[model samples]
Target: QDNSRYTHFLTQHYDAKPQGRDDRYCESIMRRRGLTSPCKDINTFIHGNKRSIKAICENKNGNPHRENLRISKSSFQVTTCKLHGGSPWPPCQYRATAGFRNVVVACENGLPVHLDGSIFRRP
Candidate 1:
């Protein structure tokens, strides 16, 4: 009995967008199920779940690609380490109480070596 009402209402108003819309998509989904106010909590929940899928699906064809690629160097390395001492660089200082953490990597070549979180520490 309870399921029948939900099914009937959804069938009447529900419109799925295979192409997708912005927030309206979630709003419509909520409204079709008899929700009057904007279900902000549910909207946030759905958006969190759908963010990855949406990113892949909607912008698959569009990306930053160049016809010709140029590189200054061929290889590089990135390291996450402690930034300590008072340097001219604003964030180059290390404070034990402040918990200084930073990423330091060598960009010798065009390629950058991705560093894991374990490499990071407070200097």
Candidate 2:
């Protein structure tokens, strides 16, 4: 049940992208993922394939945390969403920026269940 429950999260948040979308892919994904209403303050997407992300769960060097949380051993390219205007409802506007960061997720049953945080890397 846990795996099935979170499988959608990957499709919603991860998937891959080498660069960010400007003026951009934000509304596209947010609307698709049903996040427009009330306008999420922020959201992030990891630019890696499903295999690469799920593999974070299998990494021996993954950082351990309280409960089921784990920090990824590697950094990933990303795109994050920020509110563009004042629309807090559908037709919401957002700006997406490409970035480099580490993923903090909740892992259970050898699968990533949810995004806990995205740690920005200077390099």
| Candidate 1 lDDT over residue span 1-35, tens digit each | 32443344223322333224334443444445443
For residues 1-123, write the lDDT of model 2, one tens digit per residue.
Answer: 556757777766775654446646777887777777777767887776677677777766368766777887888887778877766776778877777767888777888778864453222
Q: List the residue pairs that clash in candidate 2.
A: none
> Once superposed on the true structure, which residue ranges of model 1 sit more than 4 Å away at CA?
1-17, 37-40, 43-123
Local distance difference test, each candidate: 0.27, 0.72
Q: What's model 2's TM-score?
A: 0.79
Estimated TM-score per prediction? 0.19, 0.79
- In angstroms, what RMSD does candidate 1 have relative to the true structure? 21.0
| Clash list (residue pairs), candidate 1 | 73-110, 79-105
